Amino acid sequence: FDRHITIFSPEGRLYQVEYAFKAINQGGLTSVAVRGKDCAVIVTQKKVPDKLLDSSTVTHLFKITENIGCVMTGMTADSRSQVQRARYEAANWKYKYGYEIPVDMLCKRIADISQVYTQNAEMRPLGCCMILIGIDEEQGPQVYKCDPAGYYCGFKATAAGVKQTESTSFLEKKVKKKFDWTFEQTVETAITCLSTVLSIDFKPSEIEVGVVTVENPKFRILTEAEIDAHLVALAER
Amino acid sequence: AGTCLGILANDGVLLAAERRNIHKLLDEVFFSEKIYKLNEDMACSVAGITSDANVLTNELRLIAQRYLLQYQEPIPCEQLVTALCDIKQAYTFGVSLLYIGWDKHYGFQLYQSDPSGNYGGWKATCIGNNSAAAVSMLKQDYKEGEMTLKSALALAIKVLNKTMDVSKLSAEKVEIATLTRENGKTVIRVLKQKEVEQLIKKHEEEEAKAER
């Protein structure tokens, strides 16, 4: 009914697609991906509100293949569903086509699926954001992000969530000043960015970092001792 | 919008459409066409832009070709119109059609279908822009039962002179199709630029003679 389903407004807008980005902000959580010379990291925060909850199960970092990882931001069940669909499309690319799916092709595929939600009126847009990282064989580190509108793009760095705009301002002042690279700095840039806009001076039980490197393209989820090894190195400077 | 004439004679039929371009750079290689051959012995013109025109025209061609596949004969002309008007009855295409044809049962023919699924046989008619002006100008001057293609082309350019909007009737702005029988074969001849020039200059010579 022109603002209830995904049809055009008189000025050409899709209001349910606009409200899915409001729904991403409902989670309260901000994710940041930055990209280095031979590395691409994803950092999100790990606010665990209930203390008798198993914190090893609350995670927004997801393995898609061995070489491709993923941080999700938004409505959490929508996020797990879009992760299962990405895992399906990755395995089916490998089966049909005989090689591992590129990060741009997976992110393009998930955005192509999201367009269908934005165009058929009987289902809603799936109100969450996927950021895919992974190492391309010919292009190096790739950071791709698809939104509930069905857009995707490649990103020198990006952010998703509540403090997305200020994280974008931080990283945008950052990447025109330096060419941020090296394994250590790129985790530094993605920890400082999250910390600056949340302003809460991290302890490692509170964020979680996922990396890919060109030297080992396996998607790793950082150990809490390793987030300590970055937070101590960042917190004395 | 668009408009076209259709005039039945004793030795043939014609369609006489507009070629008016809405913008100075629309190419016209694509928009030049307005007459649509449907089979070996039948043609049509639409009231509308080229996209839904082709959607109607290819369905008409497909009905004519499956008739030819069944019977190895061309489809009789009222029967193709009946087939498409039965397609347009089930959809109640805001487009009207104007058919010229020849079949072995009924000779030269001139049909006109509406969007609602009806059709009618006419002896002269117009669909599209200034339709009522053209048929009111045509009902005066169409001589029933005694007109030839020379008088039919004269009526076509006389009616299009004072019903087309183009402000100077030239051969670049009119497509004329002429469907005659030549020694056992139907000839749908889209009548070309030099002959439309010769028929406009012969018309203008008659009006400038009657002005004296």
Binding site: - | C85, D86, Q89, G117, N118, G120, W122, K139
Partner: protein, 212 residues
Amino acid sequence: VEYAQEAVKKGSTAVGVRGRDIVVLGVEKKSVAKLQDERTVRKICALDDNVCMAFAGLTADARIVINRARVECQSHRLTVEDPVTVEYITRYIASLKQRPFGISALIVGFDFDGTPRLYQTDPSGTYHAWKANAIGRGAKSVREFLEKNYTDEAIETDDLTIKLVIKALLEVVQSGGKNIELAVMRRDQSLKILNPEEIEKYVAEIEKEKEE
């Protein structure tokens, strides 16, 4: 249904009577336009070989009813080997829905043994048999004419049946002659759609019985 029934009353008057060895079925043929060809407007359509039908109402909706009944006459003839009863194809036409169509239909003809039948379908599907009936514009007054003049001695010969139909149409059809369309059957033969000359002869013998 009520929309479809008010579509009928606007339509042309159709009269059918059933005789001893003839069923006659006459429709007001109507001046359509001037440059219109009146061949395409039928209004009397043969269904099988022994079942004819006149309708009143929308001619786009009628044509699909005529086509479906005309296919099912042959399908019945292909599954059961015998011709349709007028009861059968009347019950099939009244069973047709689309909406209902928007026609009423007088369905005359002969069954295999040789019995004349006359049946009348409504848009609500509630057919029933008649000895004489009218549908269309002015139908109740023509039916009131026919509860006075349908006697045994007015239908006892073959020509007085045709003249009963003409006198019934000549109530509401005020052109007096040329503007009515007849069709008789005369069992085991065919339709015999009456000429404008034969209708004019019958009108002349009806008029000659009016100075007396």
